[PDB]
Amino acid sequence: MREIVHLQAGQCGNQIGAKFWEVISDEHGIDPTGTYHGDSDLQLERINVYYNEATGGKYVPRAVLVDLEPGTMDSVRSGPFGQIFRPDNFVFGQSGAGNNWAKGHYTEGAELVDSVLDVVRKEAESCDCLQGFQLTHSLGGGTGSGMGTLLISKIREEYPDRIMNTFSVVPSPKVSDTVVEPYNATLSVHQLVENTDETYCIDNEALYDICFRTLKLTTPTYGDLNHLVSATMSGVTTCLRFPGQLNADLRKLAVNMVPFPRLHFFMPGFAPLTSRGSQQYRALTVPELTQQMFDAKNMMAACDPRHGRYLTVAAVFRGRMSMKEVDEQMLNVQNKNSSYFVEWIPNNVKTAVCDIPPRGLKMSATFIGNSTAIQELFKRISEQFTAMFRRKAFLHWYTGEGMDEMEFTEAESNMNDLVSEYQQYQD
Amino acid sequence: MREIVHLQAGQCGNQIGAKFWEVISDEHGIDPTGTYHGDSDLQLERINVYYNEATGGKYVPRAVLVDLEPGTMDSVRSGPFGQIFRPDNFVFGQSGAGNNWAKGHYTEGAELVDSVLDVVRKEAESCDCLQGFQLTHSLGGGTGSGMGTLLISKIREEYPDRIMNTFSVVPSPKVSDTVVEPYNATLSVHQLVENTDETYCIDNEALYDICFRTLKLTTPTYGDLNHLVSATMSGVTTCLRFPGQLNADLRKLAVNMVPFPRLHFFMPGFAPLTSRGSQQYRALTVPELTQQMFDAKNMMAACDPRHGRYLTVAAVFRGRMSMKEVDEQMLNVQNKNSSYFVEWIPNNVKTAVCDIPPRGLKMSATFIGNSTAIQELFKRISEQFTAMFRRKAFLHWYTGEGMDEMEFTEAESNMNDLVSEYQQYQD
Amino acid sequence: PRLMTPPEAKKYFNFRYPPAGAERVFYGRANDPQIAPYLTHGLRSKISIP
Amino acid sequence: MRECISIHVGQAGVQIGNACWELYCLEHGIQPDGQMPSDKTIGGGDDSFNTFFSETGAGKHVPRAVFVDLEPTVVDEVRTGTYRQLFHPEQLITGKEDAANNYARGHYTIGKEIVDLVLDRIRKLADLCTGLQGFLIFHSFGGGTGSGFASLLMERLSVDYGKKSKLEFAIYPAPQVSTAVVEPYNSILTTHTTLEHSDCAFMVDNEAIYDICRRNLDIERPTYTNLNRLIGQIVSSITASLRFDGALNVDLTEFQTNLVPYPRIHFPLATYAPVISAEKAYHEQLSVAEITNACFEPANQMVKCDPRHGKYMACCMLYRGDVVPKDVNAAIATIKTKRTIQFVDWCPTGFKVGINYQPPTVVPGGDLAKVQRAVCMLSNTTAIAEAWARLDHKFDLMYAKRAFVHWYVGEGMEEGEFSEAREDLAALEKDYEEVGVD
Amino acid sequence: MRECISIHVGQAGVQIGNACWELYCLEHGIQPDGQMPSDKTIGGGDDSFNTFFSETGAGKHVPRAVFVDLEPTVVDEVRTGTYRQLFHPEQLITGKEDAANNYARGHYTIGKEIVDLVLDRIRKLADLCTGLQGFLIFHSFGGGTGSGFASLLMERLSVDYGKKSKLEFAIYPAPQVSTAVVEPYNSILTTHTTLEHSDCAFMVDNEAIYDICRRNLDIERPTYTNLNRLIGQIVSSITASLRFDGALNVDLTEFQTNLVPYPRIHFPLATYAPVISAEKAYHEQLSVAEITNACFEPANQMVKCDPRHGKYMACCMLYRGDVVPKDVNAAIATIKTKRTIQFVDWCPTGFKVGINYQPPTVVPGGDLAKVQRAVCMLSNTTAIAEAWARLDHKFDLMYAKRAFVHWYVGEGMEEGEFSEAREDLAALEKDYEEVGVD
Numbered sequence A, B: 001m002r003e004i005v006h007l008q009a010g011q012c013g014n015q016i017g018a019k020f021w022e023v024i025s026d027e028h029g030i031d032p033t034g035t036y037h038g039d040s041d042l043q044l045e046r047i048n049v050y051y052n053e054a055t056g057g058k059y060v061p062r063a064v065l066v067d068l069e070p071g072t073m074d075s076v077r078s079g080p081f082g083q084i085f086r087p088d089n090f091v092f093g094q095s096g097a098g099n100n101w102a103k104g105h106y107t108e109g110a111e112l113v114d115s116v117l118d119v120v121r122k123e124a125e126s127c128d129c130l131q132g133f134q135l136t137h138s139l140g141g142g143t144g145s146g147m148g149t150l151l152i153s154k155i156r157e158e159y160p161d162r163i164m165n166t167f168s169v170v171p172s173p174k175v176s177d178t179v180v181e182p183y184n185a186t187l188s189v190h191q192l193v194e195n196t197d198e199t200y201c202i203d204n205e206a207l208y209d210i211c212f213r214t215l216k217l218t219t220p221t222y223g224d225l226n227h228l229v230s231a232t233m234s235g236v237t238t239c240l241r242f243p244g245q246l247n248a249d250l251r252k253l254a255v256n257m258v259p260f261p262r263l264h265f266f267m268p269g270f271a272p273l274t275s276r277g278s279q280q281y282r283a284l285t286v287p288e289l290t291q292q293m294f295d296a297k298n299m300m301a302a303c304d305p306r307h308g309r310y311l312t313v314a315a316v317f318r319g320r321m322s323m324k325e326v327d328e329q330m331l332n333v334q335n336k337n338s339s340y341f342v343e344w345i346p347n348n349v350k351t352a353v354c355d356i357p358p359r360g361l362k363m364s365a366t367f368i369g370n371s372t373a374i375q376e377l378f379k380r381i382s383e384q385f386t387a388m389f390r391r392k393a394f395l396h397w398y399t400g401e402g403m404d405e406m407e408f409t410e411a412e413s414n415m416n417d418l419v420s421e422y423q424q425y426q427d
Numbered sequence C: 001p002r003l004m005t006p007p008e009a010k011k012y013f014n015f016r017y018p019p020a021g022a023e024r025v026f027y028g029r030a031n032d033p034q035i036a037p038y039l040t041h042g043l044r045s046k047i048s049i050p
Numbered sequence D, E: 001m002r003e004c005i006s007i008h009v010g011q012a013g014v015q016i017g018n019a020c021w022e023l024y025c026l027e028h029g030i031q032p033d034g035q036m037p038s039d040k041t042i043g044g045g046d047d048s049f050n051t052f053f054s055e056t057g058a059g060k061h062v063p064r065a066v067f068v069d070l071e072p073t074v075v076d077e078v079r080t081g082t083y084r085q086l087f088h089p090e091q092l093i094t095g096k097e098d099a100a101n102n103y104a105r106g107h108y109t110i111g112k113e114i115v116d117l118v119l120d121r122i123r124k125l126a127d128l129c130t131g132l133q134g135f136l137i138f139h140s141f142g143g144g145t146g147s148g149f150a151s152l153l154m155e156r157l158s159v160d161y162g163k164k165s166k167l168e169f170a171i172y173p174a175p176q177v178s179t180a181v182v183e184p185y186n187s188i189l190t191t192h193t194t195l196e197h198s199d200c201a202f203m204v205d206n207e208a209i210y211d212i213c214r215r216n217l218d219i220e221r222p223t224y225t226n227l228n229r230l231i232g233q234i235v236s237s238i239t240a241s242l243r244f245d246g247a248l249n250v251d252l253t254e255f256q257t258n259l260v261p262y263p264r265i266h267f268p269l270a271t272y273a274p275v276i277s278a279e280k281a282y283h284e285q286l287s288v289a290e291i292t293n294a295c296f297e298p299a300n301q302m303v304k305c306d307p308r309h310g311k312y313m314a315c316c317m318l319y320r321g322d323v324v325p326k327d328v329n330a331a332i333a334t335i336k337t338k339r340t341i342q343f344v345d346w347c348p349t350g351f352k353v354g355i356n357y358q359p360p361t362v363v364p365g366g367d368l369a370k371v372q373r374a375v376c377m378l379s380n381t382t383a384i385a386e387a388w389a390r391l392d393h394k395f396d397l398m399y400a401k402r403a404f405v406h407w408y409v410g411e412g413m414e415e416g417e418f419s420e421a422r423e424d425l426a427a428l429e430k431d432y433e434e435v436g437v438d
């Protein structure tokens, strides 16, 4: 059969996944000890896509934890589900990070890439035939970008025939905390654009705005943000693990979103977001879900695509629906804003229907978007580099490691090509 | 089916709408919690005209509350039926009003229109097919004038094919409290005439007089006055919601009441008004209803049309009656005062019979009239505007926000044109 | 959570909102409380046997 | 065989269509279920119902009529009535939007996407019919939806089927009573559109019907129920020849040929003589003589036209019940000797008599009398021109002051169509004037 | 004898396949166990099932179909269903990898190692069959799996077996609705591959299937259940001739010869006239005439085509039920006299009638009517070319800017084969009007 193996990288991806596996486990109903409580036949059915079998009915998560710093993993192993997580999968370095990209990409990685490669192939040999791999990390993450860029390069030649799913969070546009953060962006996204086939784009500021809008709870946890994004990743994965007349394979999807190779960056979209009173104030009806599905406020990924247009739209629906309300609703939105699509392609909707509702709500969905709204994103950073490369701030660290500004010249040149590329296709 | 969505604006209309809304629920028998206690099939059948239904038997009003001052809304929310209204529908700004027309029309409304237009188009997408909109506000009210004049312009271009009902109250002629009110009125009524199609004219001085007349209870609450005006609006809406061979559509009525485009200003008329002993001293007969219906003392809107004549008269009757008595009573008034109509049009009466009596009484009616009694209204303000425009009192404020005397010139010039227009076609 | 519907409000909820078991088929207000002895007999008029 | 298809347009004309079909189910004894008792009248659908009902082998009587209107309020309510199971769901043509009393709005804005539906019903009704002598159209001149929609529909049925008869029954506008002032607008629009396609139009007015209620029926407070009963009786009597027989049988085709003198003017007047309260008829006696004096009595007509202000051309007398020609032909001969009865000399004879042995029965819960001998007086007289003469001086005023013009031109119309109707009306009156001239 | 083999490719083609066998087991009274009650119908496998089932000495009716798919979920899900015991597990051929909507991937990458196993089933079913008139292929044009795999296998069954019929049935792509933009790639790929090997192709469209549900069935949300029940009735109706008899018996061999005029074009249209809701037909009657008025009515066909925008050459009606030829030939003569129906004059006669006395039965828990007189309409018109005309302008722009081409050439393909189809579809379109023009 066809399975999925995950990699968690960067200290964010440490917090990202840890919420994400607990989302999966509780949905499937396994206790914190690991003894599955048999309640649903279908969740016992397609658990093998992500978990292997240990003795006594314990399903090992087939993911490998990689880091450099103890404390971040110290929390997750001491966390609620660290026991189900594998110390064998806990690979780490005996050094600190410094949030320096070159150190993790040239210095610290060298003595750790060997171990992680030997690890990942061991689970690769353990399982039979993948769809591909997925990664939780950050492009703005110091150790996450540094390690992943190395690993994505090495995994390409090892298995160039599978799916290179990448889940990276974009830092806050207004403030990046890390001051050398844009430098990390160039070094990451430059290599990302070739090796990857799929990329998810996530921003925390929108997650903050989502909290003010629908959460309305003033003071959240970052784990709440982890919970929100895990719901987003879970929805697209419910496609594979659950029945219903929907075609779920990522390549079944990827060919449907990607008209041209350079299109790797995609924006997500989620389904009903509710407030304190709206739960009992809402008639859970197909129109208002789809209306709330296509809300510029329900946007959460990077920014508003109103400034641009839509390349492709793909939303997968979870609940007890029928083939016609999805049919009529697209016509309504198609006629609503017909001009805001591109005249290059008409009818860019790619819908899947999952009949297995979630646990806690019945009628749900998930949306993945590729619009013409990424320009401002790399435009925003573009002024930063043209500024901070004018006199080369913070240069002596990386140059001391063995960095040369020539590497920066092509990295920006590659992106400015993408600047025109995204521009030219739509404009 | 054809539905209606309500707009609640101005610090007055903040009061009326709740009183209006609680009457309708009490008419239909919904408890304050919102769980309709089903007792009448027809009110169950035709509640869809104004309400949507949530989960668990909860009729959500399709009304929009807008203001700037929180304490009014908090009092409204803490009211007997605030739980029935949605925090989604509670939209407001982050500034005090100051009772300035232009601050809400140019400064504060600018960043608040985006929100409400999004809200009103959300509810527009929620409903299928509309008759139109109704707006409860005041013409002498600073916040209602600024926002109302803004929104009526905006709603025109988005849906110029619906009913733009407006419900405004004329401030007291003897004293306007607000001394800048004649500026506020002249500005608003200018913008109103082009954008509106219906206007309800109500003045409170008549309401106090009626309280001395039939209520006789000396000291009422303004909410009781709201209970009076709401009954007028309830009856004109009983046409649509209730069965019986009465032609209910406002367009069915509008083409009947409106001879020519500029005729937007109209007077209400209500049926049996009864005092403490007369409830059991009244022989409730169609002749005596029509007598009290056509009483100059029953006038409540502006003033006595005795000074002028009658262009269009239309009264809707509610109860278990017959065509013949209303027909003979119709012909009595023609013979009664044949000279006090216009020779322009004979048989200027329009009649509709609602077979469904109200809850609390059986014989009832509502009257809508377009008589030649509005000359005194705007001619009154004419001397007001001229004297205050004579020496530009209180002007440095409006020059501060960005206004000029030139806007005043055409607004009154437009006003003067309508002064003549009402004059020529009757005199 | 609250009950799905008041005991007398199901019919109009089903009529006004077709989601009576998803967006289901509703007939007119008349037949809402009527008995329905229809699903057992036939539809065609007859076959004229000569 | 002998059948027709009835048409019911307008939320004015929908309750009256119910009552006649209610009245119709009484005389043939239809139980509200849709079937007879165990008695045998069902079959291939060939019995007293076959001319009106389609009672196929399923045993359910299907009225051969279509109820069309544009507001769901009344139609869904009558779909909540007692015989709704008899009524075909989408022969009850409902609507979601109104014409707002505007003829052209009901003629142009919404008529396009509804006529295709009803035409499907017509052809799928026409195919199952065998003879289909014509059509029975119920409408109104002052039609909020009756005016515009009937006018458009009567076009295609005329152009597609121009070989069969068309029966037009409508309430005439009240002369001095006006519930609406756009009524003169659409009414004159209907006349100029219908004069060249309608076969035979028959007008009635409510006020005189109300006047009859408290003169002899002795009801100062009647209702539609009795009003629709009377016209329901009226159409029932004219259809008795289709239902039952007599010494001779007459048909609408003979009615058409023998009533309308010349083209254009096809507007006769109907009147039913034995309209008397129940207790009066008991201690009195009905015979052909006195009832015929009543039918030719000037105030007996339901339309405000004055017989000695005009002159008579045609006359139809449908003797439903137990009568013999002997007293029949004697009484009419005395009328020929009567001097006040001033017919036009162009017709030495203008009398069309129809006898039907079946006596007119009472209706349970009704207000009529126990009629053994009855008649409908169908006649045309020159006394009708004043009604349109009332209309034009009514119409000419507001047209000069172009009241409500913005409304009609707002939805896309112009004054040329308003212009054409006035000389059309002028043409009829001068046509009416010349024919009155010897 | 008189038997055939059903082919169900792609999970889109399997839930429909589940329904028909669910339907088929009903009219034979097949219990979900797989055996009859104590009654005597089993033997050497020779009774009404012998043409459909294989009920050998074991007493279990073995369906004569293979349900092949490349995603195991539903086929294993249906393997947990109700009749899974009847179904043979390796006649329920499953796959472990999908084609990603790519025709070539399902045509080249994986189909090679699977078709041989499928061929094993075919030959091992061929040996037990005796007459095996032909094959019944259920598929889809816009197949994530149905498109690519069917093409290769329908070649392989053609090359080894070029002496028998192959009956293919697929959903046509919705003209204005498309779940993806890959279908214009694979569908036109399927068309050019099939035409020189396909025998007679029949298409249908789900929108109109939905449209009729809330037109006459009055269902505003049906499901695949009803959708498969409708088409299952369609395939049941065409297969009644093999099951039972009538006034005359016809075969798919006659269907091919008398329907296709000339090579290449083998694309007729299917329709069922007595589609109606439950409560409707109870209080009316259906006969040969109105259903014939219904059958050829332009809005009653499940394909978005206006017959007045084309011309007819073939029309096959399959009267399942008890009808006399008298009203049959009388009705079609009136249809022949109809002027709107513009047959091509190349065919004076174009009517192929199939009479089967057996009344079509209902499905328990169903939504159809219970009717005795029914007809399935098999007809072809030149009002179909605009569908491909719609697809080519859909395709031509996209090929110019070559979207998703990297996906296809990435797995080893090129543009020459894509080039072949556009003039081939141009070849298809110029053939259509040339036979259209006289």
Ligand SMILES: Nc1nc2c(ncn2[C@@H]2O[C@H](COP(=O)(O)OP(=O)(O)OP(=O)(O)O)[C@@H](O)[C@H]2O)c(=O)[nH]1
Binding pocket: A009, A010, A011, A012, A013, A014, A015, A097, A098, A099, A100, A137, A138, A140, A141, A142, A143, A144, A145, A146, A177, A178, A204, A222
């Ligand atoms: N875990 C976590 N990460 C956050 C949070 N908010 C922002 N981030 C960012 O997520 C990024 C990814 O973390 P890692 O890739 O593991 O970081 P690193 O490689 O160890 O080095 P740094 O990025 O400098 O921290 C960080 O760079 C943070 O800037 C948060 O609340 N929790």
Ligand SMILES: Nc1nc2c(ncn2[C@@H]2O[C@H](COP(=O)(O)OP(=O)(O)OP(=O)(O)O)[C@@H](O)[C@H]2O)c(=O)[nH]1
Binding pocket: B009, B010, B011, B012, B013, B015, B097, B098, B099, B100, B137, B138, B140, B141, B142, B143, B144, B145, B171, B177, B178, B222
């Ligand atoms: N709510 C309320 N309003 C009243 C009452 N009596 C008079 N009004 C007038 O109704 C008007 C309409 O209120 P709004 O339009 O909300 O007034 P505003 O825009 O906030 O500014 P102001 O008119 O100065 O209050 C007010 O201007 C009052 O002058 C009353 O008893 N209750």
Ligand SMILES: Nc1nc2c(ncn2[C@@H]2O[C@H](COP(=O)(O)OP(=O)(O)OP(=O)(O)O)[C@@H](O)[C@H]2O)c(=O)[nH]1
Binding pocket: B245, B247, B252, D009, D010, D011, D012, D013, D014, D015, D016, D071, D098, D100, D101, D139, D140, D142, D143, D144, D145, D146, D147, D171, D179, D180, D224
């Ligand atoms: N034929 C008929 N007319 C009635 C009845 N009751 C009242 N009327 C009169 O008939 C007129 C109805 O005409 P319209 O208003 O144009 O009717 P419509 O065109 O179907 O559309 P509406 O405006 O909605 O009624 C009214 O003005 C009444 O005066 C009735 O029961 N039958």
Ligand SMILES: Nc1nc2c(ncn2[C@@H]2O[C@H](COP(=O)(O)OP(=O)(O)OP(=O)(O)O)[C@@H](O)[C@H]2O)c(=O)[nH]1
Binding pocket: A245, A246, A247, A323, E009, E010, E011, E012, E013, E014, E015, E016, E071, E098, E101, E139, E140, E142, E143, E144, E145, E146, E147, E171, E179, E224
């Ligand atoms: N035949 C059929 N089609 C369906 C059904 N439900 C939805 N569809 C439509 O039919 C199409 C099926 O085509 P594909 O998705 O390519 O089917 P496939 O090639 O077998 O591969 P999958 O994607 O796994 O289903 C879908 O795009 C739907 O739009 C169904 O039950 N049967």
